[PDB]
Amino acid sequence: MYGDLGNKLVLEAKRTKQLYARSNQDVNLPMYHEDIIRNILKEVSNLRKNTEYLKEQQQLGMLDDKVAKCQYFVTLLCMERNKRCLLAYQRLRTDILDSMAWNNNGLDLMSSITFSQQDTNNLSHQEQEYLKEYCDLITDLKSGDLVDIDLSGSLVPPSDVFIDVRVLKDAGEIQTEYGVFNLIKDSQFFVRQSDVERLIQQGYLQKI
Amino acid sequence: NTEIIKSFKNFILEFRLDSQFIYRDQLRNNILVKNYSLTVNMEHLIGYNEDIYKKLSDEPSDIIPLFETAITQVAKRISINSLPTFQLILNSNANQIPLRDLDSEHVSKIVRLSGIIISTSVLSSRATYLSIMCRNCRHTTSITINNFNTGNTVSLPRSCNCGPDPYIIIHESSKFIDQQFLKLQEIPELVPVGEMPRNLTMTCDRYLTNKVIPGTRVTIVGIYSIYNSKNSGVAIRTPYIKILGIQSDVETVTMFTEEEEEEFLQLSRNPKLYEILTNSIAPSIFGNEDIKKAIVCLLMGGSKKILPDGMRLRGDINVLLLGDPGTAKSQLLKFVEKVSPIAVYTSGKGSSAAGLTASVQRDPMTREFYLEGGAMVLADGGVVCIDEFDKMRDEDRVAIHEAMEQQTISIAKAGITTVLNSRTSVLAAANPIYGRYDDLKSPGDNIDFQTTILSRFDMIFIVKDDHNEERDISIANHVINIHTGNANAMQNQQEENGSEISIEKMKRYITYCRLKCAPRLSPQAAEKLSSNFVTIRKQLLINELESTERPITIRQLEAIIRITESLAKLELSPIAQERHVDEAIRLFQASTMDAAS
Amino acid sequence: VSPQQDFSDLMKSWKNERCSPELLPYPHQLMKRLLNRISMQSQLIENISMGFLDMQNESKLPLLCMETELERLKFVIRSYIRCRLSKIDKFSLYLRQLNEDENSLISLTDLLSKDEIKYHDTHSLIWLKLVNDSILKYMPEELQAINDTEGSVNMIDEPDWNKFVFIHVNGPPDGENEFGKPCYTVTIPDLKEEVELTIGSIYVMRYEVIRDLLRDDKVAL
Amino acid sequence: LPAHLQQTFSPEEIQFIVENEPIKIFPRITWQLITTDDKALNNMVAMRSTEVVLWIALLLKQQSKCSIVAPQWLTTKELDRKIQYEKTHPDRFSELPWNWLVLARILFNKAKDDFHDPIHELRGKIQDLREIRQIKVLKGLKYLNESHLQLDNLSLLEINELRPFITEIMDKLREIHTASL
Amino acid sequence: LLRHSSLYDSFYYSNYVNAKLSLWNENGKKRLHKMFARMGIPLSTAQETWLYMDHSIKRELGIIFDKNLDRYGLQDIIRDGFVRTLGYRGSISASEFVEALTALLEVGNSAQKLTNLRKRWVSNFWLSWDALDDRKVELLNRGIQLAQDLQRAIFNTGVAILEKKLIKHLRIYRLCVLQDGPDLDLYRNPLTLLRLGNWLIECCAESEDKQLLPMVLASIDENTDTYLVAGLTPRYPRGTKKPILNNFSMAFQQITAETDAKVRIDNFESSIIEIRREDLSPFLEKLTLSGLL
Amino acid sequence: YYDIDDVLADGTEFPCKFQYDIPGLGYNPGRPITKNTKLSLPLWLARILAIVGPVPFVELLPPDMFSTKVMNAIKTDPVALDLHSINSHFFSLAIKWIMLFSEKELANVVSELLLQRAQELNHHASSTSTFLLKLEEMEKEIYKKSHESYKDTKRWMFK
Ligand SMILES: Nc1ncnc2c1ncn2[C@@H]1O[C@H](COP(=O)(O)OP(=O)(O)OP(=O)(O)O)[C@@H](O)[C@H]1O
C-alpha cells in the first residue's frame, strides 16, 4: 500500500539470480532499473516533506500527542522498509560482477573491458570506478604476497601431466613466455599440464 | 520354465556395457518413485544369446510371464510385505508393415505398427489376485491370473456329495488391472488405390495407459493374438492387438528434460527471433510478409483471466482470410496443420453444421443415448481450419455464434445439458463474389447480408491481384526452383544448418514456451493505445458522411491488447515494452485502411 | 619439524575451515616456515635442470616428479587464502564491531596477516562510497551509519552459531586424563542430556558445544 | 571467490586427500627423488614390498616400469565375510576400509591389466556394496532425533553426499524447537 | 554394411554386382527377384534376421552360395574376411568399417570463397580421427546412417548420366562432361569423385576385349570454372599380368607448360587437376594426338 | 544477511484491527479511523505495532484458517498437501508468528511435518494447468542444491 513498488523491485531481483546461477557461468547482467528506482525516490521525497510539517506542528498544534506520537512511527517505519529493498537489490547487483573481477582478473588484455556488455556500459561504466577499484585492488594483491602464488583462477585440482588439447576459433602468434607454442589453426597439442591454464580460462584452447 | 528363469535372474543384474552397470542402476531408480516397470529395449538385449531370444520370438505368453516373475524376484532382493507385480515394456524398430499382414504368418508374432488413435473408452477392471471360498467346507485358496491366451484362461475348479461349481468371488483381498478398448485407425496415406481404411482393437495395462489423446501419430509394438466373443456362418474369430510399448513421438503434462530448453534459452537470448521466423516458417512461400506475421501469433495465443468475479475475458485471436484464387489462401492451410500440437482439418462444406459441435445416437447396449462425437471437443488448445464461407447457406452461422466469444456450449438434446469446456481457436479462408468485380464496384457485397459474423472475427486480410512486371518474374523464377531440380532440399540445408529453423523443431518449441510463462502487458503503456484509438473512430466517422455504410466496433480494440500479448509469449518476457507494442499496431494499421478501400 | 610433519598439519588445518561457520586464527607461524621452502625448491630445480641442458653438447624421471609436486602443494594454499577472502567479505561489519570497541579479541597477527586487513579496510571503504552518492543522497538523519539499532537486526552479525558439521573424533590415546568407560570424551549441551562421543564415531553437533575442543586439536572434522 | 561450491566439496578433490596416502608396489628399476616427502632409494631391488605414496606410482605406471600389488582385501573370496555380518545386522555396518569406493575407481582406470581376474567378478562384488550401504542410510535418517546421530563406518563419498541437505534440513527445524521459547 | 543394416538394402548394390555382371537399370528388378528373394523378406523381426535369425538363413546362404556358384558365376562375393567384437554390443567387421570412415570424412560440417571452403575439409577431418577408441561410440553410428543414403544419392545421377548416353568414345578414352544435372553440390570434395568413378569404371566392366582405357569426367559447382577434372585406372576382371599405373601425369606436365592460362596443380594428388572452361576443350585436342601409353 | 528472499516473504498480509483512534490514514478521507475496524496489515509495521503501547494500538486478529482448518489437514497425510496455495511461504511466516505469540501447541505440529516432507525429498532425488505444479512450490531452495550433488557425483564416478 505504501512500499508496494519495492516488492515489485525485489521480485524482479529474484529473476536475475535464477537466470545466472541456475544456467551457467556467463553473467550477461540485464539492466539497472533507474526508471524503477526513481519512483521510490519520488515517493521518499514526498514522505520526508510530510514529516517536517508535523515536525513543525508538534510544538504549535496538538502539543506532542501520544496519538500524534505513533503518527511519526508510520512515517518512520516506511523508510527502513523501503531502505531494506533499495540496497538489497544494490548488493545482489554488485556481488555478481565480482565474478568478472575474478574469472578474467588479468590473463590477456585485462584493461580491455570492451567487447563485453556495451549496452550496459552505461550501467557498469558508471560503476567502473568500483570495478576499476576492485581491479587495481586485486593487482597489488597479486604482488602483496611476498612469493608469487597465482590467484587468477586454476581452482580445479590437477590430475596428471599430459593432456590432449585441441584448438579452434583462433589465430595469430601468442605465448611469448614458457616457450612459444606456435599457435596455428586447428592443431592438436599434447603438452605438459602446467602451461595451459592461462589459455583455457582465456578460452583459446578448447577441449581437454 | 524354472531352468529358463535361472537364466534371467542371473542376467539382469550383471549385464553392462563398459563400466556403467545400467540395469541395476535404473531398477533401483524405479523402485524409489513408484512405477514398477522396465524398458528392456530388445535390440540391446541380444548380447547374451540368440537362442534365448529365439525361445521368445517364436513362442508367446509363456515368455512374458516367466520374465515378469524373474524381475519381481530381483526387485524383491533389492530391498532388505507390500510388493506388487511389475509390467514389461518392449521396443524395437525393424519396419512397419502398415495394415497388410492379416492372417498368413503374423498370428502370435512380434510386430511393429504405425497409426492414428481416434477413440478412447472408459476404464474397467480385471482381477489379478484372488481368494476363493467353497460353499460346503469353507476351503480357501488363491489363484493369480497374469497373462492371457480377456478372461477364461483357467476357470474355478471343482475340488476341495460335493455339489459342482461350489466357489465364489469374494471382494475383500484382491487387486485389479484396467483395460482400455481404445481403437486404432490407419494413418491415411499408405494404402492407396481407391479404398476406405479399416480399424482394429487394442487393450493395455495401467502403468502405460492414459498416455494418448486422439489426433496424433503413434508407433506401437505388440502381439497379434486372437479372442473369441459370442456376442455368422463358419466358426470364425476376431483379431486384436495386445500392446506393449507406446514409444511414440511427442504428446503434441509438461514433463521433459532440461537440454530441450537449453538451446531454446540459448536461442531466445538472441533477439532475432521475430524476423527470422517469417522466413523459417514457410520455406516454399514467396514472401507475403504481412500475413506471415499473423500466423505465428495465432498459434501461440494470449492468456486466460478468471478475474475475481464471475465473468472472464476471451483471451485468444481468430484471423480470417479472403481473396482471389491462385494467391495461396488455401495451400498455406495444410502447412499450419502439421506445425500445430493439435490440429483438425475439416475444411470443406461445413459438414452438416449440427454435427460439427456434438452428436447423440441410440447406443446398442441398454438402448440409451449419450454424447460421442464433435469437431470442437477434440480441438482444445490447438486450432481448427475450415474454408468456403459463402456456399454454406444453411446453418454454419447458427453453429459458430455460441461456439465463439464465450467457448461454452451446452447440448440441449434428449439426455444431458452440460456446459463442457472449450478453448478453441478458429481459422478460415473464403471467396468473395468472384473476386475481381467486387473490388471494382461499390466496396460492400462481400458477405451478402450479415456483418454480425465479421464482428466476431477481428483480424482480416485482403489480398489483391496487381500487375507488377518486375517481381513476378522472380516468382516465375521461384517455382521452377522448387518444382523440379529439388535444389531447395540442398539450399535449405546449406542456409538452415546455422541460421534457419527446421519444420519439426517448432513443434518441439511452441508447446514449451506457451506452457511456462504467464505474461502481462506494461502498465504505463496504456496511455499509448488509448491515445491511438480516439482518432480511429474519427477516421471511421469521416467516411459515413459520404452516404457510405457496411465494420469496426470495440471488440477489435480488445483484440489488439491480445496481439501485443502474443509476441510477449514469443520473447518470454513477463513485462511488455514500447518497442514491443509499436510493431503490433504496425501490423494492424496495415489492416485498418482496408475498410476504406 | 620434518617436512612430512610440516605438511600433514597444513592439510588438516585447511579442510577444517572449508565448512566452518566463523573464522579461525590464521596460523601464520607455520606458514613462514614453509614460505621460504616454496621459493627454495623452485630455485633448486631452477639450475639443476640447466645442468641437464648442458650435458647434451638420459633420465626423464627425476625432473617430472619434482615439477608436479611443489605446484600441487602450491595449489592447496591457492584455495586456502581465497576462502579467507570469501569469508572476510560478508563478516566485515561484524568484525569491525569486534574491533571498534575494546573487548576480549583483537584482529591480531595470528588472526589475520598483512594484506587482507589492507584489503578489508579499503574494500569496506569503497563499498561505502557506492551506497552513499548513488543511493543515500536522500537518506534522512537517522539512517547514517549502516548498523542496526532495532527493528530488523540483520546489519550486525552472522549468528549461524549452531550450524551442524560432521565430526571425526581422533583423540590421541595415552590412557592420561581418562574419565569415560571406553575412552575419555566429554560433552555438555545447553539443555539436553550429556550423552557423548566415545573414540572415533562420526557424529553431528552444534558449534559452541565443540568450539572449546578445537583449540586443542584432539578431534578433527 | 568461488561462490559456486563453498559449503561442500566437489567430487574432483575428495580424491585429492586420499591419493596422498601410501600403498605397496613391486618395483623394477634401479638424487632421483628430492620431493621433500620423498624416501628416495638407491638401485631398487625387485620382489620387495615398499610403502610408496600412490600418486607418483600412478605416474610411474604411465611410463610402465613397475607393477602394483593389490591390498589385502581386494579379492572376491574376502568380501564374502563382509556381506554376512551386515545381513544379520540391520543395526549398522561393521568393517570398512574407510576409503574403498574412491580407491577402486582409480584401480580400474589404467590399473586393469595387473591383477588376476578383476573383470566380470569384482564389479559384481562392489556395486552391491554401493547400495546395501545406502539402503541402510535410508532407514537411518528417518530416525532423526534432535542433534544426535550415530554414523560409524561411512565412506568419504557418502558423507560428501548426505552433507549438503542434512545440515539445513535440521537447522531449519532447530529454529522452531529453540525459538519456540 | 550388412551386419549394421538391412540385407534388404542389398537391393541397390546387388545391381552394382549386376553392374559387375551386365546391368544397372533395365531388367534388374525383373531379374533380382529370385536369388535375393528367398522370401518376400519378412519385416517382423528383420532387425534380427540380419542380426540373429540368419543363424539359419545366412547358413542357408552358406548352402546357397555354393549352389549360386553356377547360377550366374557370380564369385566376387566369397571372401575370407576379418572381424572384431567388443564383448557385447554386436560384432563389427573391418570391411564395412572403412566405409564409414570415408563417408564421415565428407559430411559432418576475386577467388575469396575458397578459403572458407579449404578450411572446411580440415575441420571435418578432425571429427573422424577420434573415432577409433571406445571413448566415443555414439557418432560411429552417424556415419552408418550417412553411408546408406549418400550411396543412394551418388547413384541418383549415375543412372541419369548412363541413360543420358553422353559417353563419347573418341579414339582411346571416353569423355563425359557432367555439365549440370541435379544435386551438383556434393562434388567439390575430391573423395566422392573417385568413388563415383569407381562405380563408373564398373559400368564399362563388361567384356571390352579392345579399348581398355579409363575415362575422364568433368563437373562444376562454383565460380570461374574450377572443374576438378580427374582420371581413373583401368581394371582387370580378376583373371596383374601387366601392371598399368598411369599415362596421364606424364601428359599433365605438358599442358601445364604449354598453354599457361589458368591451369593449376594446387590440389594434392596428381590424378586430379583444375582447368578453365575455354581451355578444357583444347585440353583434349593436345591429348588426342599425344599418344603416351 | 541482506535478506534476498524473506523481505518479500514479509511482504505478505494479516487481517487485524485497532483499540484506539488515530488520524493517520494512508489507506481515504475522513482521517480518524474509527476503532475496532478490520484492516489489512503488512508484516513490517504490524510485527512491532503489536508491541509498542502497555496496551498496544493494534489488535492481533489471528488468521485462524492458519490455525484450525489446515492444522488437522496437515495432521492427516503429509505426502501430498496444500502447503502452498494458503502460504506462498509457509516457513518464515510460521517462524515470525511464533515469536510474538509463543504457542507451544502448533510448535509440535510442524516439527512432525518437516521431517516427513523431507522424507520424500531425499528418496525422491535420484536420477500444469494454471497453478498445479504448486505441490512442488515451497521446496525449491530446499532440495535443488542437493540435486546438483548427486548429479556431478555420478559424473566423476563414471567415465
Ligand atoms: N506466394 C506464393 N509463394 C510460393 N508459391 C505459391 C505462392 N502462391 C501460390 N503458390 C504455389 O501455387 C501452387 C498450387 O497452389 P493452388 O493450386 O493450391 O493455388 P490456389 O488454391 O488456387 O490458390 P488460392 O489458395 O489463392 O485459391 C503451390 O505449389 C504453391 O507453391
8 A C-beta contact, residue B344 and residue B215: yes
3-class DSSP state of B399: helix
8 A C-beta contact, residue B212 and residue B240: no
Closest-CA distance of chain B to residue E119, Å: 16
Q: Which residues of E44-56 are buried (b: 16+ CB within 10 A; e: fewer)?
A: bbbbbbbbbbbee
Kindly state if the Cβ of B427 falls inside 6 Å of ligand 1: no
Which amino acid is located at B40 in the chain?
V
Kindly state if the Cβ of B328 falls inside 6 Å of ligand 1: yes
- What is chain F's Cα-based Rg? 20
Report how far residue B357's alpha carbon sits from residue B409's, in angstroms, rounded to the nearest whole number.
8
Query: What cell does B14 get?
Result: 550383471
Atom of ligand 1 minimally distant from the CA of B326: 23
Q: Which residue has the cell 447458427?
A: B398
Report how far residue D23's alpha carbon sits from residue E144's, in angstroms, rounded to the nearest whole number.
47
**What is the helix (H) or strand (E) element at residue B241, kind and residue range?**
strand B241-245
CA of B429 to the centre of ligand 1 (A): 14
Question: Is D124 an interface residue toward C (CB < 8 Å)?
Answer: no
SS (H, E, C) chain E: CCCCCCHHHHHHHCHHHHHCCCCCCCCHHHHCCCCCCCCCCCCCCHHHCCCCCHHHHHHHHHHHCCCCHHHHCCCCCCCCCCEECCCCCCCEECCCHHHHHHHHHHCCCCCCCHHHHHHHHHHHHHHHHHHHCCCCCCCHHHHHHHHHHHHHHHHHHHHHHHHHCCCEECCCCEECCCCCCCCHHHHCCCHHHHHHHHHHHHHCCCCCCCCCCCCEECCCCCHHHCCCEEECCCCCCCCCCCCCCCCHHHHHHHHHHHCCCCCECCCCCCCEEECCHHHHHHHHHCCCCCCCC
3-class DSSP state of B420: strand
Contact C154 F2 (CB under 8 A): yes
Domain interval for residue F123 = 1-159
Identify all chain A residues contacting C69, using CB atoms and an 8 Å cutoff.
none
**What is the helix (H) or strand (E) element at residue B354, kind and residue range?**
helix B354-357
Report how far residue B102's alpha carbon sits from residue A53's, in angstroms, rounded to the nearest whole number.
95
Contact A161 C151 (CB under 8 A): no
Question: Is A155 an interface residue toward D (CB < 8 Å)?
Answer: yes
Query: What cell does B176 get?
Result: 485389479
CA of B327 to the centre of ligand 1 (A): 6
Beta bridge partners of B369: B362
Report how far residue B36's alpha carbon sits from residue B52's, in angstroms, rounded to the nearest whole number.
24
CA of B325 to the centre of ligand 1 (A): 8
DSSP chain A: --SHHHHHHHHHHHHHHHHHHHH-S--------HHHHHHHHHHHHHHHHHHHHHHHHTTTSS-S-HHHHHHHHHHHHHHHHHHHHHHHHHHHHHTTTTTTTTTTSSSSS-S---SS-STTTTTSGGGHHHHHHHHHHHHHHHHHSSS----SS--SPP--SEEEE-B-S--S----SSS-----TT--EEEEGGGSHHHHTTT-B---
Closest-CA distance of chain D to residue B89, Å: 25
Closest-CA distance of chain A to residue E195, Å: 28
Closest-CA distance of chain C to residue F84, Å: 26
**Torsion, CA F105, CA F106, CA F111, CA F117, rounded to 10:** 150
Q: Helices C114-131 & A128-144, crossing angle to 10 degrees? A: 180
3-class DSSP state of C187: coil
The CA distances from residue A173 to A179, A184, A185, in Å, are 12, 8, 11
8 A C-beta contact, residue B89 and residue B208: yes
φ and ψ at residue B362, rounded to 5 degrees: -65, 130
Atom of ligand 1 minimally distant from the CA of B324: 26
Question: Cα F25–F50–F42 angle (5° rounding)?
Answer: 55
φ and ψ at residue E50, rounded to 5 degrees: -110, -5
Domain interval for residue D27 = 1-181
Query: What cell does B459 get?
Result: 483480424
Q: How many CB atoms lie within 10 A of CB B318?
A: 20
Q: Which residue has the cell 555396518?
A: D93
**What is the helix (H) or strand (E) element at residue D22, kind and residue range?**
strand D22-27
Residue nearest to atom 4 of ligand 1 (CA): B285
8 A C-beta contact, residue B238 and residue B226: yes
C160: nearest CA partner in chain F? F1
**Resolution reached, in Å?**
3.9
Q: Which residue has the cell 512432525?
A: F112
3-class DSSP state of D100: helix
3-class DSSP state of C199: coil
Which amino acid is located at B323 in the chain?
G
Q: Judged by CB atoms within 8 Å, which residues 82-121 of C form the interface with D?
A: 82-83, 85-86, 89
Query: What cell does E281 get?
Result: 576443350
Report how far residue E193's alpha carbon sits from residue E217's, in angstroms, rounded to the nearest whole number.
9
Q: How many CB atoms lie within 10 A of CB E216?
A: 20
Q: Is B328 annotated as a binding residue?
A: yes
Best of D1, D102, D109 to substitute, by most chain A Cβ atoms within 10 angstroms, is D1
Best of B14, B43, B63 to substitute, by most chain E Cβ atoms within 10 angstroms, is B43
Best of B11, B16, B77 to substitute, by most chain D Cβ atoms within 10 angstroms, is B16
Query: DSSP label at C64?
Result: H
Question: Is F48 an interface residue toward C (CB < 8 Å)?
Answer: yes
Report how far residue B320's alpha carbon sits from residue B461's, in angstroms, rounded to the nearest whole number.
7
Query: DSSP label at B325?
Result: T
SS (H, E, C) chain F: CCCCCCCCCCCCEEEEEECCCCCCCCCCCCCCCCCCCCEEEEHHHHHHHCCCCCCCCEECCCCHHHCCCCCCHHHHCCCCCCCCCCCCCCHHHHHHHHHHHCCCHHHHHCHHHHHHHHHHHHHCCCCCCCCCCHHHCCCHHHHHHHHHHHHHHHHHHCC
Atom of ligand 1 minimally distant from the CA of B288: 1
What are the strands of the beta sheet with E174-175, ordered from one edge?
A: E168-169, E174-175, E216-217, E229-231, E272-273
Closest CA to D68 of D29, D112, D105, D33: D112
Question: Is F156 an interface residue toward C (CB < 8 Å)?
Answer: no
DSSP B485-500: S-THHHHTTTSTTTTS
φ and ψ at residue E226, rounded to 5 degrees: -60, -60
8 A C-beta contact, residue E151 and residue E195: no
Ramachandran sector of residue B425 (left: φ over 0; alpha: ψ -120 to 50; beta: rest): beta
8 A C-beta contact, residue D18 and residue D102: yes
Report how far residue B169's alpha carbon sits from residue B267's, in angstroms, rounded to the nearest whole number.
61
Q: Which residues of B11-28 are buried (b: 16+ CB within 10 A; e: fewer)?
A: bbbeebeeeebebbbebb
Identify all chain A residues contacting E122, using CB atoms and an 8 Å cutoff.
185-186
φ and ψ at residue B250, rounded to 5 degrees: -70, 170
Question: Is B307 an interface residue toward F (CB < 8 Å)?
Answer: no
Report how far residue D126's alpha carbon sits from residue D133's, in angstroms, rounded to the nearest whole number.
11
**What is the helix (H) or strand (E) element at residue C43, kind and residue range?**
helix C28-53
Kindly state if the Cβ of B488 falls inside 6 Å of ligand 1: no
Question: Is B77 an interface residue toward D (CB < 8 Å)?
Answer: no
8 A C-beta contact, residue F4 and residue A81: no
End-to-end alpha carbon distance in chain A: 56
Closest-CA distance of chain F to residue D109, Å: 9
End-to-end alpha carbon distance in chain C: 23
8 A C-beta contact, residue D177 and residue F109: no
End-to-end alpha carbon distance in chain F: 40
Q: Alpha helices, DSSP H only, in D63-154?
A: 82-85, 100-106, 124-141
Q: How many CB atoms lie within 10 A of CB B53?
A: 19
Q: Which residues contact A104 (CB under 8 A, 6 or more apart)?
A: A110, A201
| CA D32 from centre of chain | 30
Report how far residue A166's alpha carbon sits from residue E123's, in angstroms, rounded to the nearest whole number.
11
Q: Are B and C neighbours with ≥3 CB pairs closer than 8 A?
A: no
3-class DSSP state of B50: helix
Query: What cell does A190 get?
Result: 599434447
| CA B159 from centre of chain | 53
Closest CA to F10 of F37, F48, F54: F48
φ and ψ at residue B112, rounded to 5 degrees: -130, 130
Residue nearest to atom 21 of ligand 1 (CA): B330
Report how far residue C120's alpha carbon sits from residue F24's, in angstroms, rounded to the nearest whole number.
45
**What is the helix (H) or strand (E) element at residue B408, kind and residue range?**
strand B408-410
| CA A6 from centre of chain | 21
CA of B341 to the centre of ligand 1 (A): 25
Q: Alpha helices, DSSP H only, in C89-198?
A: 92-100, 114-131
Report how far residue B342's alpha carbon sits from residue B514's, in angstroms, rounded to the nearest whole number.
14
**What is the helix (H) or strand (E) element at residue B585, kind and residue range?**
helix B578-588
Pairing type for strands B217-222 and B226-227 reads unpaired
Delimit the domains of chain E by residue range.
Answer: 4-74, 93-293
Domain interval for residue B389 = 258-590
CATH number at residue F128: 1.20.58.2050
**Dihedral sign of CA atoms F90, F94, F97, F101 in order:** positive
8 A C-beta contact, residue A140 and residue A146: no
Report how far residue B533's alpha carbon sits from residue B552's, in angstroms, rounded to the nearest whole number.
11
Question: Cα B333–B334–B335 angle (5° rounding)?
Answer: 85
Which regions of B290-401 does DSSP assign to beta strands (E)?
A: 319-322, 343-345, 359-363, 368-373, 383-387
Q: Judged by CB atoms within 8 Å, which residues 78-107 of A form the interface with F?
A: 78, 81, 84-85, 87-88, 91-92
Atom of ligand 1 minimally distant from the CA of B478: 4
Query: DSSP label at D38?
Result: -
8 A C-beta contact, residue E197 and residue E161: no
**Torsion, CA E98, CA E99, CA E102, CA E108, rounded to 10:** -120
Question: Cα E102–E108–E113 angle (5° rounding)?
Answer: 105
Q: How many CB atoms lie within 10 A of CB B220?
A: 23
The CA distances from residue D76 to B544, E258, F158, in Å, are 97, 80, 22
Closest CA to B86 of B64, B117, B114: B64
CA of B286 to the centre of ligand 1 (A): 10
**Dihedral sign of CA atoms E80, E81, E86, E92 in order:** negative
Closest CA to B126 of B150, B142, B90: B150
Q: Which residues contact E137 (CB under 8 A, 6 or more apart)?
A: E89
**Dihedral sign of CA atoms B75, B76, B81, B85 in order:** positive
8 A C-beta contact, residue F41 and residue F15: yes
Report how far residue B265's alpha carbon sits from residue B99's, in angstroms, rounded to the nearest whole number.
42
Q: Any idea how long chain A is?
A: 208
Query: What cell does D166 get?
Result: 542434512
8 A C-beta contact, residue B228 and residue B237: yes
Report how far residue E139's alpha carbon sits from residue E129's, in angstroms, rounded to the nearest whole number.
12
A85: nearest CA partner in chain C? C135
8 A C-beta contact, residue D146 and residue C192: yes
Which amino acid is located at C170 in the chain?
N
Q: How many CB atoms lie within 10 A of CB D108?
A: 15
**Torsion, CA E107, CA E108, CA E113, CA E114, rounded to 10:** -60
Question: Is D142 an interface residue toward F (CB < 8 Å)?
Answer: yes
Closest CA to B390 of B347, B333, B430: B430
Report how far residue F153's alpha carbon sits from residue F125's, in angstroms, rounded to the nearest whole number.
13
| CA B99 from centre of chain | 22
Report how far residue E6's alpha carbon sits from residue E152's, in angstroms, rounded to the nearest whole number.
14
Question: Is F156 an interface residue toward A (CB < 8 Å)?
Answer: no
Contact F127 B29 (CB under 8 A): yes
Question: Is F158 an interface residue toward B (CB < 8 Å)?
Answer: yes
Report how far residue B503's alpha carbon sits from residue C14's, in angstroms, rounded to the nearest whole number.
56
Query: What cell does E272 get?
Result: 586430379
Report how far residue D69's alpha carbon sits from residue D25's, in angstroms, rounded to the nearest whole number.
5
Question: Is A139 an interface residue toward C (CB < 8 Å)?
Answer: no
Contact C151 F1 (CB under 8 A): no
Question: Is F124 an interface residue toward B (CB < 8 Å)?
Answer: yes
Atom of ligand 1 minimally distant from the CA of B286: 3
When divided into structural domains, chain D yields a total of 1
Closest-CA distance of chain C to residue F2, Å: 7
Q: Which residues contact C112 (CB under 8 A, 6 or more apart)?
A: C26, C88, C120
Query: What cell does E198 get?
Result: 569407381
Q: Is B351 annotated as a binding residue?
A: no
